[PDB]
Write an enzyme that holds these catalytic residues in place. Structure first.
Site, PDB file in Angstrom:
ATOM      1  N   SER A  96       0.932  -1.105  -0.130  1.00 49.13           N
ATOM      2  CA  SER A  96       0.139  -0.080  -0.024  1.00 49.13           C
ATOM      3  C   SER A  96       0.904   1.263   0.147  1.00 49.13           C
ATOM      4  CB  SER A  96      -0.937   0.068   1.374  1.00 49.13           C
ATOM      5  OG  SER A  96      -1.928   0.741   0.939  1.00 49.13           O
ATOM      6  N   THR A  97       0.808   1.993   0.940  1.00 47.77           N
ATOM      7  CA  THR A  97       1.347   3.275   1.271  1.00 47.77           C
ATOM      8  C   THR A  97       2.842   3.127   1.100  1.00 47.77           C
ATOM      9  OG1 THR A  97      -0.420   4.363   2.370  1.00 47.77           O
ATOM     10  CG2 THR A  97       1.914   5.534   2.524  1.00 47.77           C
ATOM     11  N   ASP A 123      -4.741  -5.118   5.050  1.00 47.29           N
ATOM     12  CA  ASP A 123      -5.175  -6.179   3.857  1.00 47.29           C
ATOM     13  C   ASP A 123      -4.069  -6.782   3.517  1.00 47.29           C
ATOM     14  OD1 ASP A 123      -6.273  -6.995   1.578  1.00 47.29           O
ATOM     15  OD2 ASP A 123      -5.873  -5.454   0.308  1.00 47.29           O
TER      16      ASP A 123
END
Ligand code: NA
Ligand code: NA
Length: 342
Positions: A157-158, A279
């Site tokens: 993600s990030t 996630d």
């Protein structure tokens, strides 16, 4: 604790007030200054010392990427880009991520009320993340070509665009296939794959439904579909799933990890990289239970130690590893499960 001090840079007068309305409406943050261009932002950063900067990509009269380059070099700070869902915005945003911005948001249609409130919650989410974030090529040799049954699954993600770039860049053409799910809007994933392809010896592309999963290739999940491994007879295939998001994620790392656990099992290695949220945590546990070896990026190298942390807490992570050892560890691990050919 004190409110997060945010400085907003945007060429549009309306957006500068919109960002002011959005951010100030949340109780844990405030806009301490706005600026229409990089020059005015320079002195406002020095006067108000913001913790987080939001930066719109499209600034007409000047060059914002060189401002971002100079900023990350001489006064590095968390920067969240604001981009348009366009091809020109996607190229500039990815280049901003290369220069040191940690994340980005796409503007939805703010003329519709639900687009404004969704943007509002997304902006607040990125700002809270950014206030805590950590701010951030030899080709590996003598890699044997393994069985085409061998596969690596990666989620991020990030910070994941840079983490994935560091992992893929040293991979030799004999690397096993990689399936990669990175949280990203549609369109951006295509430009993401195209930029990685130009930097990598392996072929990097956006995954297409039904295509065979080949050694020496990395398949990037499209921004609007779940990426899954499937088995068409004897051969691995890409399956794109237009089913609903799961906890607001599509593509979902959990969905990818579960499909790999199912169709590859012990022939796979799972890698969970930097990012916020959980996630991938539960899917990595299914991967672990199916006999795959699992790696998680360590905290010291994560921009955000959220997704690897949750994966660790779930109990499905075999090994925690610094980002710059991931490439070697995943190749060595998947190679160890390969008998001699010779
Ligand atoms: Na506020
Ligand atoms: Na390439």
């Amino acid at each position: 604790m004190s409110k997060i001090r945010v400085l907003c840079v945007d060429d549009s007068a309306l957006m500068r007030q919109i960002m002011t309305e959005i951010i100030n409406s949340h109780p844990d943050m405030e806009v301490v200054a706005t600026a229409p261009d990089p020059l005015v932002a320079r002195d406002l950063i020095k006067k108000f010392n913001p913790q987080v900067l939001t930066l719109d990509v499209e600034m007409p009269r000047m060059d914002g990427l060189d401002f971002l380059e100079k900023l990350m070099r001489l006064r590095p700070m968390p920067v969240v880009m604001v981009s348009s869902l366009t091809g020109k915005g996607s190229e500039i945003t990815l280049r901003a991520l290369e220069l040191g911005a940690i994340d980005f948001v796409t503007k939805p249609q703010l003329g519709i009320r639900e687009g404004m409130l969704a943007y509002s919650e997304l902006i607040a989410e990125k700002i809270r993340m950014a206030a805590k974030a950590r701010l951030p090529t030899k080709i590996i040799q003598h890699m044997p070509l393994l069985s085409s049954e061998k596969l690596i699954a990666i989620g991020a993600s990030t910070g994941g665009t840079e983490a994935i770039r560091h992992v893929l860049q040293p991979l030799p053409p004999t690397s096993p296939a990689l399936l990669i799910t990175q949280h990203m809007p549609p369109g951006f994933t295509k430009s993401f794959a195209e930029r990685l392809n130009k930097l990598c010896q392996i072929t990097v592309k956006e995954a297409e439904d039904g295509e065979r999963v080949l050694p020496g290739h990395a398949y990037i999940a499209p921004g609007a579909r779940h990426l899954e491994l499937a088995r068409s007879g004897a051969n691995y295939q890409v399956r794109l799933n237009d089913g609903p998001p799961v906890n607001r994620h599509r593509p979902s790392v959990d969905v990818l990890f579960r499909s790999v656990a199912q169709y590859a099992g012990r022939n796979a290695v799972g890698v969970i990289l930097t990012g916020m949220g959980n996630d991938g945590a539960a899917g990595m546990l299914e991967l672990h239970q199916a006999g795959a070896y699992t790696l998680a990026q360590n905290e010291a190298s994560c921009v955000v130690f959220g997704m690897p942390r949750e994966a660790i807490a779930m109990g499905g992570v075999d090994e925690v590893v610094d980002l710059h050892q991931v490439s070697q560890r995943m190749l060595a691990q998947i190679s160890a499960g390969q008998a001699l050919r010779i």
